[PDB]
Amino acid sequence: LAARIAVSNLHKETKKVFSDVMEDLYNYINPHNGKHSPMVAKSTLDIVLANKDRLNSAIIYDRDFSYNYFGFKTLERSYLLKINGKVAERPQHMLMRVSVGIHKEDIDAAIETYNLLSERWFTHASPTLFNAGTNRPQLSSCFLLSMKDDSIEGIYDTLKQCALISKSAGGIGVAVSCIRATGSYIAGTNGNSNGLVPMLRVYNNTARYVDQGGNKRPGAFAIYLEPWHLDIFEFLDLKKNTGKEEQRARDLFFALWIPDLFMKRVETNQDWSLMCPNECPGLDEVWGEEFEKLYASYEKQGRVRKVVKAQQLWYAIIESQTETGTPYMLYKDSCNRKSNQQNLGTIKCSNLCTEIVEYTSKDEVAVCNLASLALNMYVTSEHTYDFKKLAEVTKVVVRNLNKIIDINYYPVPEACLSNKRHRPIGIGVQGLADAFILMRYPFESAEAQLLNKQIFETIYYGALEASCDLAKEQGPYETYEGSPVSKGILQYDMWNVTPTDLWDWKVLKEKIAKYGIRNSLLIAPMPTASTAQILGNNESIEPYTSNIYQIVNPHLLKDLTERGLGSIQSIPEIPDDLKQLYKTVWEISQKTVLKMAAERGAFIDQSQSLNIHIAEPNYGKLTSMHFYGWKQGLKTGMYYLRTR
Amino acid sequence: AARIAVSNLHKETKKVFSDVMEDLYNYINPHNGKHSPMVAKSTLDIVLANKDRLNSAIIYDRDFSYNYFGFKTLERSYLLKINGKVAERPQHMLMRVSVGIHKEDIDAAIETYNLLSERWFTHASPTLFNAGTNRPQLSSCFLLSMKDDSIEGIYDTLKQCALISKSAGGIGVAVSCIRATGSYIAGTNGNSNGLVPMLRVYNNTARYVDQGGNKRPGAFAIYLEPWHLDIFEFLDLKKNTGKEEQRARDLFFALWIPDLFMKRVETNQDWSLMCPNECPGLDEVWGEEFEKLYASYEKQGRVRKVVKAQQLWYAIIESQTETGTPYMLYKDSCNRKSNQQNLGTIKCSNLCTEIVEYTSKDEVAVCNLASLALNMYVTSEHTYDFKKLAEVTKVVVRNLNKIIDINYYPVPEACLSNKRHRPIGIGVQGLADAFILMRYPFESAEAQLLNKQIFETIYYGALEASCDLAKEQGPYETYEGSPVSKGILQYDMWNVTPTDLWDWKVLKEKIAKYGIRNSLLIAPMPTASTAQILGNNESIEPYTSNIYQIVNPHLLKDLTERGLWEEMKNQIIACNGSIQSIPEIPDDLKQLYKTVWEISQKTVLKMAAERGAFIDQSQSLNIHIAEPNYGKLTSMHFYGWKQGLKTGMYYLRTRAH
């Protein structure tokens, strides 16, 4: 379209030779300073120059035209390096920089990755697209932290960490439940705590202050609170648009880290006890029956600051969700029961976008490196799915993320310790809805439903095989022995699911039992809000967003063209055949969505950034939606509540 | 009515001092079940070893010496409670405070107990709260410079603030090294948003972290030098009106002003705005050296915006007209006249604008504070007792020197700082009452001499104590190369020759021989609480009003005695604390009891400069103008500046505020 014209113009205004554009980037001198400020690492430039003919000549510049209009503009704004406000890099250079950036001296490996990327089989995360092959690169997306200690020293030490992580272009999930509550005694000053609200206001303004890297994208901290904490009612108010500034912190994000007992008590209309973690230590450090045991003993002991009806807190959760679409809902017990890191102690939160379930502690900060598979690329013109090709590419991605753990420059050393001990990674997807469309399957169709399982079966299987071979080459991760996986327990086992006959799990179990695996966690479906737009696919595991993005969806176009002929259910001309296929996210049952998430969930060792779209959310509809999700086994029952 | 209040407390409290101390220590939290001593084992132990001397040293009648409010303030906050029930009588408190400082030296402890109970001086609230206890943070003031122009150092300095406020310290903070809005950040390849959003983080930290249990909100004073590019926005931060992201209303604000700025305003020249990242080291030089660096950066084109000096000046006045801030400090006077200038450039003052101490990346300066009750030193003869002032100042000097050595510093950079340079801050209250006792109007030439001689005396006293301390213990670490070590005392630095009241020659012989234990001694602080307790006018301020409904004790007395004193009360109240229009009172007493609002501010400034010459730190000098305008405030700031003052204004006070 006009996409062609803009790409042609970029090609006019940039050098075509990849090693030359790389020289210009390393050689760059800042004109206000006169300082040599290379925009690429010398180490990378060296490897490139020693292999230039092969690398320069591997590049297929016609692939630059593969992007659509908004995809190309997005790259142009943010992903392609600028020498003095003027773009130096073509998309293809950027992808080959990233590729050598990850692979270094191994050109064979670098070209494999380059082609996979440039053809759009998968993509790496933005922080990796931005920073790979540059100096002291921070390539990770997700960070998780626990509040260090219930103290001014720990609060401010943890605040310094958020600041530094967020400068380094990372996102944050922070567990704050150990902080003592409004009204609680402080021996050190003979005073009374003001609790979480004003503490969080500091974090709030620290997020407003420290941009994520340097393109004006604002600090992003998700705050996690278990609903047994006394300050919960006020916490559920912090993001509301009205009220007094002292009672608010609207630039943060809010998640609940929810025990089973709470939902239990809500369903049965039982009483709910509110505690201070100082009066009642260690509730965040146990889960399930052990949590239930400790919680109940505390109530029996009178270590309770307020008893409220569970439906009263529930009602406040739902009020907050209707106003703000927040907080996010995580089931603490499902998170911990079905985690391959449970040998490490209780997991205290998820991350910014609700898909990472990794252990944290006062001296470990969870980190995750991310990548997403483009599931549309694996559909044939035959309307079969090429599961062999998916497993195959997945294995390359695992290899890629594993290498990044070792390359990365961590903003705080507790992040480095964490990643080096457990080697977790996070392979996600985008294009799921496109894959259904291309196989001619309505999202809600039983065919959709089988393909849903078999895709994630495939991803996990391939992911495991890759990590297993990495474990033969390099040894398993430090904390492997004692993990569920080290006992032949795999994710689906933990859901008591039996996998279809597509892959031979037996043989893979034997492989792992003999060699073990390199990475404690492998799969984690992230949002893909940037990289999805770049590749031109529906975000993530979301249903079809709409038939428009001033452009009509290319799949609907092609099909409507092949027949010779916003929602499309209103247009009488279009056959009922295609009306089913191209239902929007507003016209799909959310129950179904939760079932499918649970179903793919069995093959996902972390969790999934699962939005729920409801037009006109009410108490009735959210209550059933949440209980259905919890009862279905979800780690994350809801990321955002989306509405019109 | 105050008698009743005291005997009630005496009914509701154990007499014997040693016992009340036992109940404090042996205290168990009814909630916890935890032994949570409200005094420290070593201070209890000392008390019991010496309970006979100490118990019977206490004179419980002295408790009757407080007026109504002073007693109530004590009850509110200074007297320790066992489950919401005051256990301490004011004497128990003052004796605790005395053993808490002097410990096994009971001769010393009693000497200090008497001085305190008779109200010859007072220690600072911090010292009164925590002396003799487990967490004894006895100091009031802390000063800090931002550690580095980096997220690492912004957040490291923030924590320090946090820790310090928690332990009930007030803070002055220098923020000029922080790079300005729009400026390049190499390590992210993006651009800074400058100071405002940074201070929003500080702002909410001060809201969040209280001083003590009192529930006192954290008190941070942010200092900026007016060459910084973000100055107009800085000046808006405290304004009622405006978006929340452009405001930081819980902070306090001072300007750290070079002579150059004031010269360009007066000559109506252009003023250049700079970013410290582009223009490094402006806050690390003062005076000619600053002047030479500022200028050479202008010639180099390292300049982000040029404005008329006067445009910036107008904004400063606007800002003060609404909030009464920022505080006005003259950087060059502060540095030119500091005994700490051997250490390098001083970057800010404190919360209350009276201390001027060196800060650095490894040093957070601290001051321990005490005030002399100047009323006490007037004899029945209507003469001033300068020998008694000196004798008491020596004791105080010694107390604050001991305190340096026993204080719990909340950040190791304070510990380092105080132990290296040993600055103290001796201040005053009851200056207005001393003039009134001597029958001198505030503005009389008689008051002006007394002013000078009072402060001449305090300084001599303080120096002679610190010298004796240096004879005993050695001089302070960094004393050699200081002005005092070259024979240069504060007054030399103002080119003032002292009156003939004291023999400064002899004192310099002594100092030339043994040097001095403390690098700074004197610093009139605001005394908002302790003056209320002691029933004295605040600090160095003129008489604030004739009504507090309690008619001033001195007017009352003076009128009753002459037979001129009921309704008067109402008429003074309806003239807003003034007596200048009451028919019955002689012209005699009208001149004597002029209030702050009827006293020339130029004279006020003149008198501060004149005591100035005998104050090695600075002074919390408020300015009272009922109906400010631009010309009025301008001539006021220029006169103070040209008069050599270190602090030119603390708060602007007016009819409205």
Ligand SMILES: Nc1ncnc2c1ncn2[C@H]1C[C@H](O)[C@@H](COP(=O)(O)OP(=O)(O)OP(=O)(O)O)O1
């Ligand atoms: N001055 C303060 N203002 C507001 N909150 C405070 C203040 N001081 C402490 N807190 C909060 C922070 C923590 O949530 C809790 C304990 O803080 P902390 O620094 O450990 O006090 P502390 O150690 O002197 O007493 P304790 O032994 O009870 O913890 O109280």
Ligand SMILES: Nc1ncnc2c1ncn2[C@H]1C[C@H](O)[C@@H](COP(=O)(O)OP(=O)(O)OP(=O)(O)O)O1
């Ligand atoms: N992410 C950020 N968001 C907003 N301001 C920032 C950010 N990072 C730094 N700043 C501000 C804080 C400091 O005043 C100034 C320098 O920050 P700093 O941590 O030293 O960055 P840097 O070291 O990567 O770059 P440089 O070498 O230019 O100082 O910029």
Ligand SMILES: [Mg+2]
């Ligand atoms: Mg503590």
Ligand SMILES: [Mg+2]
């Ligand atoms: Mg830096």
